[PDB]
Amino acid sequence: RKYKQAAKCLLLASFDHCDFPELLSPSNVAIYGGLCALATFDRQELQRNVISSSSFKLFLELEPQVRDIIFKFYESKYASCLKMLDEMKDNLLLDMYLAPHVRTLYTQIRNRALIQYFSPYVSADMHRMAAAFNTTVAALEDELTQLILEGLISARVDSHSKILYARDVDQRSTTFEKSLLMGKEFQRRAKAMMLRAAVLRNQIHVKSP
Amino acid sequence: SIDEIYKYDKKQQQEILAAKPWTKDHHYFKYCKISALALLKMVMHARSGGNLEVMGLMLGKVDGETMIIMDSFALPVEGTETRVNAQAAAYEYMAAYIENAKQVGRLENAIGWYHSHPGYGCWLSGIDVSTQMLNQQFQEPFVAVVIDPTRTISAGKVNLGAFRTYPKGYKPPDEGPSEYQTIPLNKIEDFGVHCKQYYALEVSYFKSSLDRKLLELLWNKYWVNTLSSSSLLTNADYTTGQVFDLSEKLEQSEAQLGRGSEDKLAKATRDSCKTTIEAIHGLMSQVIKDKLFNQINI
Amino acid sequence: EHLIAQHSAIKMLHSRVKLILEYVKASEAGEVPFNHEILREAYALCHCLPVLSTDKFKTDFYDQCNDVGLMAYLGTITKTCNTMNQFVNKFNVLYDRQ
Amino acid sequence: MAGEQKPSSNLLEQFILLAKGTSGSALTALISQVLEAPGVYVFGELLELANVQELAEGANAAYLQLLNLFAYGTYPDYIANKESLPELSTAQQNKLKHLTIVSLASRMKCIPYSVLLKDLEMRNLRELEDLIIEAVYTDIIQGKLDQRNQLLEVDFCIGRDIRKKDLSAIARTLQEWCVGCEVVLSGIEEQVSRANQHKEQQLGLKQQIESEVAN
Amino acid sequence: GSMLIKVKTLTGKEIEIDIEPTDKVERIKERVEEKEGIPPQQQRLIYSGKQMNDEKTAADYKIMGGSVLHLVLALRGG
Ligand SMILES: [Zn+2]
C-alpha cells in the first residue's frame, strides 16, 4: 500500500519485454498501473507522467476508456468520470487484484475529485455542481460533512445557501491563538515542574502498602 | 594632560618596540592603548566589507607594558579566516602610508594587522592560526585583535581583545583568556586545536578632551536620527536566521546531552536569551519612536 | 548607551528650536521683529501631530510588538528551559549518576 | 524682493512705495494689485505703514475688513458677508475659499470634501476637486486626495497668510506643548536612568552573590 | 615580509612587496590594493596562462622575489 514506488514502476512499463502471460493483461497492465498512480499522484508530475508519458504510450494507448477517463478527470467531467469509475467498480471487482482495494481506490478517487475542483474556489456553491457529481443535496452536503471531518478550508455553509463559503483569511491571528495556548500550557508545565522539584527534593513519593 | 597619551614619542614608542619584553615574558604586554582608528574603519569596513574577510597593517606603538593600536580596519578583500598568512598582503598600504606619514610628522612605524571578518569577526582562523602563530614567532609583538562586526551590530558593545597568542613553547600561564567563540565549520576544529594558545591585552582607549566634546556634539544632533531608525525592518531576517540557528543549536544540545560544544544546552539557552534580548531591544527603540511620535494628539 | 545619542541630538536641536522659542517669544513680547512666518509654522506643527492615527499603524504596531513579545515569550521559554536542563542535570548529579 | 513663502516677490516694496505714493483711489489701485498676493493675504508689518493704516479705515475700510479676513476670517464669512468686504475676482473669491480651506487642512489631518463643499459653498465634485487640485498645485498641500475618508490627505502645508496675531498666544502655546512632550519624555529619561541603571546594579549585585556562592 | 615579490599589472607594473613564504595571495591582494589603489579582484592573478587562486600562498606557485603576480588589473588606481 506504499503505492508511490508502485506507480514509480507502473510508469516504467517497457513494452519491448513484450511477453508474459502471467505478467498482466495490458488492459489490466495499464489500468492497474495508471490507477495506482491516479490514487498516488500529485497532478503535475503525473500529467508529466501521463500527458508526457512516452515509455507507457502503448500502455497508454491500451485502454481508451481509462485514458480519457483520467484525461477529462483532470479536465473534470466528474459526472461521467465517476460514472465509469463505479461502473468499472464491478469489473475491478472482476479483477481478483482490483477487488481488494476497491474501497481504498474509490475512496481516494472521490477524495481527490474534491481536491481537484474545490481548490480554486472561495465559496462552494453546490446546485449545478451537485448536478454534476450526482449526489443528492443531503448526500452532497454530507459528503461535504465528511469533508468537514478532515477538510482543509475554514469553510461554512448557509444550508439555505445550499452553498459553502470556503476557508478564511488570517493566519497571523491564528498564530496568536496558538501562541497563547502555547504560553498557557508552558506556565502550566512550569508550575508543574516547580511542584515537581518540590515533591522530589521534598523526598516525596508513595510507599507500596 | 588629556593629550599626554596622544603624544607619539617615536623615541619612546620605538624604544619599547625594540625593547623585546615578550622574549623575556610573552605576557609582558597586558594593556592595549588604542586610538579609535581601530574602531573607525575596523567597524565600518567590516560592515562595509559585507561578508568579505580582510587583512593588513595597523598603525600603532607601545607604551610601558602596553601594545598600542593607533589603527585597525578592513580591506575590500576576501580570503581572511582561511588565508595562509592573509594580513601580510595589505601591509603595502603602510608600506607607503606610514613612510610619508613621517612627512607630516607621523613618524610612527607599522605595528600590527588591520582586518575584519565582515559579519563574523576580526581574528585569525585555522589557516590564520597558522598565520597568527607563525607570525608571532615571526613578528612578536603580534596580536590577534578581535572584534566581531555583526556581533558589534546586534550587541551594542565593542568586545575588543588584543590576543597575543601563546607562541610555540609558551603555554597559557595564569592569564590566558582564550576567548572561545562560535566558529563556522571551517575553523572550529582548528580553534579547538588552538583555542588556548592566546591571551588578551587590557585594551584601554586614549583620546583628547576635544574628542569627548566632539562625540557629545555628535549626539547633540544625532538624537533626531535616533528617533528615525526603523531597524526592526532592517534585520528581522537576521532574527529569522537566528530562529533557524537556534532551533539547530537546540537540536545539537539535544544530541550532546543524550548519552555522552560543552553543554550545548546551557550555551544555547544563553545565546537564545541573548539574541531574543537583541530583537527585543530593537523592538524597544522602535516602539519608543512609535509611541512617542504617534502619541502627539492634537 | 544607545538613547544618549538620541538624547544628544535631541538636545542639540533642542538648543536650536529653543533659541527659536526664545527669539520667538520676543517677537510677541516686544522690540524684536514682527513677522507672520513665525508661529504660523507652529500651526503647521500642531497639524503635524501624531502622524498616522491612522489605525493602519495601529494594527502595524500590534504586529511589531506582538512579534517581539512572542519572541520574548519563547525566550520564556529559553531561560527557564536552560534552568530546567541544569535542574535535570543536578537531579542526575545527586539523585542520579549523570 | 526677499524670498521665502510669499506671493509675487515684487509685492513688499511694491506696495510699500505704492501706499507711500498711491493713496485714496491710487491706494485703491494699490489694493487691487495687492489682491492677487496669495501667501501674503495679511499685511501685519505691511499694514505697519500708516499709508495702509489709511488704506484701512479710509475709503478702503471694507478692504481692511477683507485683510483681517485673510488674517482672521474665511471665505464662508464672505458667503455670509457677501457685501461687507470689497469686491473680489472669481479667482480671488476662490482664493478666499483657499484661505478657509488651507486653514481647515491646517486644522485637521484631512478635511472632508463635504466640509468645504458646504462651508465654501462648493456644490459638486468637479469644481470641488478643481479648486482642490489647484490648491495642491500651488504646492501648499502635500498629502493626496483622501477620497475614502472623503478628505484631503495632507502631508505638508505652506503658510497661507500672515494672519494677524494670536502670534504671542500662538508661540506660547507652542512653548507649552513643546515643554509638555519634553517633560513626558524626560520623566521617561530618568525612569531609564532608574531601570536599566537599576539593571546594572541588580545584575552586578546578583553576580556578586553568584560569585561569592563558590567560596 | 620575508618574501619580497613583485605584483605586476598587465602593462608590466612590477611592485616590490614584503611577504612571507606562506603569505596568502588572498592577503597579498590586500597588500597590492592597500599599496596601489587598484583593487585586486580585477588584479586577476594568473600564473603562466593559468590563474593563480586568489585564496593561496604566493610560494604555492614557487613565487619569489622577482616573481610576478598578475593584475588583469585596472588603470584608475595608478
Ligand atoms: Zn591563515
Curated annotation (Swiss-Prot), chain A:
Main location as per UniProt: cytoplasm
UniProt KW Phosphoprotein keyword: yes
Positions of post-translational Phosphoserine modification: S208
GO molecular function: GTPase inhibitor activity
Phosphoprotein is among the record's keywords: yes
GO biological process: one example: protein neddylation
Subcellular location, record wording: Cytoplasm; Nucleus
Record-stated family: Belongs to the CSN1 family.
Subunit structure, as described in the record: Component of the CSN complex, composed of COPS1/GPS1, COPS2, COPS3, COPS4, COPS5, COPS6, COPS7 (COPS7A or COPS7B), COPS8 and COPS9 isoform 1. In the complex, it probably interacts directly with COPS2, COPS3, COPS4 and COPS5. Interacts directly with inositol kinase ITPK1. Interacts with CAPN8. Interacts with USP48. Interacts with ASB4; this interaction negatively regulates GPS1.
Functional note: Essential component of the COP9 signalosome complex (CSN), a complex involved in various cellular and developmental processes. The CSN complex is an essential regulator of the ubiquitin (Ubl) conjugation pathway by mediating the deneddylation of the cullin subunits of SCF-type E3 ligase complexes, leading to decrease the Ubl ligase activity of SCF-type complexes such as SCF, CSA or DDB2. The complex is also involved in phosphorylation of p53/TP53, c-jun/JUN, IkappaBalpha/NFKBIA, ITPK1 and IRF8/ICSBP, possibly via its association with CK2 and PKD kinases.
Protein name: COP9 signalosome complex subunit 1
Originating species: Homo sapiens
Lineage: Eukaryota, Metazoa, Chordata, Craniata, Vertebrata
Gene field: GPS1
Curated annotation (Swiss-Prot), chain B:
Enzyme class, spelled out: hydrolase
Keywords for the protein's UniProt record, in alphabetical order: Acetylation, Cytoplasm, Cytoplasmic vesicle, Hydrolase, Metal-binding, Metalloprotease, Nucleus, Protease, Signalosome, Synapse, Zinc
Family annotation (Pfam families): CSN5_C, JAB
Coiled-coil boundaries: none
Domain MPN: start-end pairs: 32-169
Gene Ontology terms, MF aspect: deNEDDylase activity; enzyme binding; macrophage migration inhibitory factor binding; metal ion binding; metal-dependent deubiquitinase activity; metallopeptidase activity; transcription coactivator activity; translation initiation factor activity
Protein name: COP9 signalosome complex subunit 5
UniProt function note: Probable protease subunit of the COP9 signalosome complex (CSN), a complex involved in various cellular and developmental processes. The CSN complex is an essential regulator of the ubiquitin (Ubl) conjugation pathway by mediating the deneddylation of the cullin subunits of the SCF-type E3 ligase complexes, leading to decrease the Ubl ligase activity of SCF-type complexes such as SCF, CSA or DDB2. The complex is also involved in phosphorylation of p53/TP53, c-jun/JUN, IkappaBalpha/NFKBIA, ITPK1 and IRF8, possibly via its association with CK2 and PKD kinases.
Domain-related comment: The JAMM motif is essential for the protease activity of the CSN complex resulting in deneddylation of cullins. It constitutes the catalytic center of the complex.
Binding site for Zn(2+): H115, H117, D128
Record family assignment: Belongs to the peptidase M67A family. CSN5 subfamily.
Residue numbers covered by motif JAMM motif: 115-128
Swiss-Prot record, chain C:
Tissue: Widely expressed.
Family to which this protein belongs: Belongs to the peptidase M67A family. CSN6 subfamily.
Record localization: Nucleus; Cytoplasm; Cytoplasm, Perinuclear region
Included stretch of the parent chain: 219 to 316 of 327
Quaternary structure and interacting proteins, as annotated: Component of the CSN complex, composed of COPS1/GPS1, COPS2, COPS3, COPS4, COPS5, COPS6, COPS7 (COPS7A or COPS7B), COPS8 and COPS9 isoform 1. In the complex, it probably interacts directly with COPS2, COPS4, COPS5, COPS7 (COPS7A or COPS7B) and COPS9 isoform 1. Interacts with the translation initiation factor EIF3S6. Interacts weakly with RBX1. Directly interacts with COP1 and 14-3-3 protein sigma/SFN. Interacts with ERCC6. (Microbial infection) Interacts with the HIV-1 protein Vpr.
The protein's name: COP9 signalosome complex subunit 6
Residue ranges, annotated region (Interaction with Vpr): 1-98
Domain of life (superkingdom): Eukaryota
Function of the protein: Component of the COP9 signalosome complex (CSN), a complex involved in various cellular and developmental processes. The CSN complex is an essential regulator of the ubiquitin (Ubl) conjugation pathway by mediating the deneddylation of the cullin subunits of SCF-type E3 ligase complexes, leading to decrease the Ubl ligase activity of SCF-type complexes such as SCF, CSA or DDB2. The complex is also involved in phosphorylation of p53/TP53, c-jun/JUN, IkappaBalpha/NFKBIA, ITPK1 and IRF8, possibly via its association with CK2 and PKD kinases.
Gene expressing this chain: COPS6
Swiss-Prot record, chain D:
First-listed, main subcellular location of the protein, grouped into a coarse class: cytoplasm
Positions bearing N-acetylalanine: A2
Assigned GO CC terms: COP9 signalosome; cytoplasm; cytosol; nucleoplasm; nucleus
UniProt subcellular location: Cytoplasm; Nucleus
Signal peptide extent: none
Purpose: Component of the COP9 signalosome complex (CSN), a complex involved in various cellular and developmental processes. The CSN complex is an essential regulator of the ubiquitin (Ubl) conjugation pathway by mediating the deneddylation of the cullin subunits of SCF-type E3 ligase complexes, leading to decrease the Ubl ligase activity of SCF-type complexes such as SCF, CSA or DDB2. The complex is also involved in phosphorylation of p53/TP53, JUN, I-kappa-B-alpha/NFKBIA, ITPK1 and IRF8/ICSBP, possibly via its association with CK2 and PKD kinases.
Subunit field text: Component of the CSN complex, composed of COPS1/GPS1, COPS2, COPS3, COPS4, COPS5, COPS6, COPS7 (COPS7A or COPS7B), COPS8 and COPS9 isoform 1. In the complex, it probably interacts directly with COPS1, COPS2, COPS4, COPS5, COPS6 and COPS8. Interacts with EIF3S6. (Microbial infection) Interacts with vaccinia virus protein C9L.
Family as reported in the entry's similarity comment: Belongs to the CSN7/EIF3M family. CSN7 subfamily.
Protein name according to UniProt: COP9 signalosome complex subunit 7b
Organism: Homo sapiens
Organism taxonomic ancestry: Eukaryota, Metazoa, Chordata, Craniata, Vertebrata
Entire-sequence positions represented here: 1 to 215 of 264
